[PDB]
Symmetry: C3
Subunit: 215 residues, 3 copies
């Protein structure tokens, strides 16, 4: 399940499979994709928050019970013309780490861990390294990718992945306050700014999609 709500002109997506640490299934992604495509044209909606249920995980990534449907999710996140805030209520690992990094702004709390443990399951990584490098450069990215380690919140914040660290019980309010502030920016400049970020990163995104079929 995924929940949808609004807080004034801010649409909220809550990942809601807490007993599976909000791990992704294909129907959850299909629903989130549709919602992302609506919020984007929807006039009630000036910004978007994604968050997870409970206090253990934003999302653990793939339910341990194709590369194209994933590309369709990444593409729907990259297409937004409106600001997207990640309210990290806990750990974001694997494909959830990637989704979190496709948000505009990240807020977490001190128990949030982030990273990409795919190598330990024998999965070769293409999307993660692209996105991590575009934010961190090749030295952090290589170590993160080959170790598969989860970084603590403080490290995430210090290297620029988490923009705000607050008390666990304030994560959502801080996320709302940021989303509200970004909702107030002039919409044309917002859309054009976001389109510009997309264009700057598009060749690298295409490259790692194509590297993904192959590899």
């Amino acid at each position: 399940d995924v929940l949808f709500s609004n807080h004034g002109r801010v649409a909220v997506i809550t990942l809601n499979r807490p007993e599976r640490l909000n791990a992704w299934t294909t129907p959850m992604r299909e629903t989130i994709i549709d919602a992302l495509e609506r919020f984007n044209r929807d006039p009630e909606v000036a910004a978007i928050i994604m968050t997870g249920a409970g206090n253990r995980a934003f999302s653990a990534g793939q339910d341990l019970s194709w590369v194209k449907e994933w590309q369709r999710y990444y593409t729907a996140l990259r297409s937004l013309s409106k600001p997207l805030v990640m309210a990290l209520n806990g750990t974001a690992a694997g494909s959830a780490f990637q989704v979190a990094l496709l948000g505009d702004i990240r807020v977490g709390h001190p128990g949030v861990r982030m990273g990409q443990p795919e190598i330990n399951a024998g999965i070769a990584s293409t999307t993660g390294p692209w996105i991590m490098n575009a934010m961190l450069g090749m030295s952090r990215t290589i170590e993160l990718t080959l170790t598969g380690r989860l970084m603590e919140a403080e490290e995430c914040h210090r290297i620029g992945l988490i923009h705000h660290l607050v008390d666990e019980d304030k994560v959502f309010d801080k996320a709302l306050e940021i989303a509200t502030e970004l909702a107030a920016k002039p919409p044309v400049a917002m859309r054009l700014d976001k389109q510009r970020f997309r264009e700057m990163t598009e060749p690298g995104f295409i490259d790692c999609i194509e590297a993904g079929e192959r590899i």
Copy 2:
């Protein structure tokens, strides 16, 4: 007004509209462009400092009383074969933030704020994001661009934008001392190094110029 001086073989450009927080006008930029083109062939001149007058601002950016003439300024800064030190006597915002980041080395003091508040005036940004990303990666850049916030000096220094933080009254001396040290480097290796930085960043620079007409 803009002032020109020399301190031995170091040419100094002082931005001198203090009552307007050294905000840029078209005649100031025209004059600075000419000076930058002379200092580059001038044999008396082994390095260059830019600084602003007074203690409130390096520059506030555009006088609140085209994209091509701006491109001509950026191009004149990128063309130098000689080292360019930014003595940040105060805040560098908007297009002044960009100019500051086209220097080789930045020196400031603890009250210096930096950033790009263009979104709050409904201006879409193309140059800023290019330059910020080339130094900071996409996570800091996106947040800086969509918030339009001014960063404090300590943040600027910690993330690598400001190379030296010193006492407000030492900013210019530290700038001179750095410029003097760089003036002493072998000139051929300096010019070739600087040409190499230009070549590494040129495709991204072209891209954001062309994105600028469009957007």
Copy 3:
């Protein structure tokens, strides 16, 4: 001289010209190149450590007693399908700084300095700036390249160049422990991950090789 050893399935390359601060000569590089090409197909070998002899330097860089043979070394380091850990027993300067940064993981201790002092000898730099920028962005890179300064260990670690700082006498054990942990990762995902890092950086590598003939 260069020493070769194994610690279980970890091959170890020790740079062994301590009286010349392990500065590179052409026969040392020729030997290291061959060893790197063997370890890569060798079935006994799941990971590789490079380190230097003594306690003053990993390597000082070029023996102060062509750009193609160097490119052959860089290419042999980039070709590994197996993890490469840099046990930094001391300072890595000039071309040794570059080699160190072509490792996957770096471990040092608090007296390790790193950087590129080439400008002070009138050498123009192309490889260094490429690699430093891919890890650090253009602001740190420009300052490092034009100053030619050596950074302290703590700075290296904070900006992400050194992954682990430990006591001088623990550097090698920490390097072994990391190399052992990476040796245990599934080999196919390791090789594919490393090939992916190579592909992401290959155009920039080609560009700076070609800039190297010219410049």
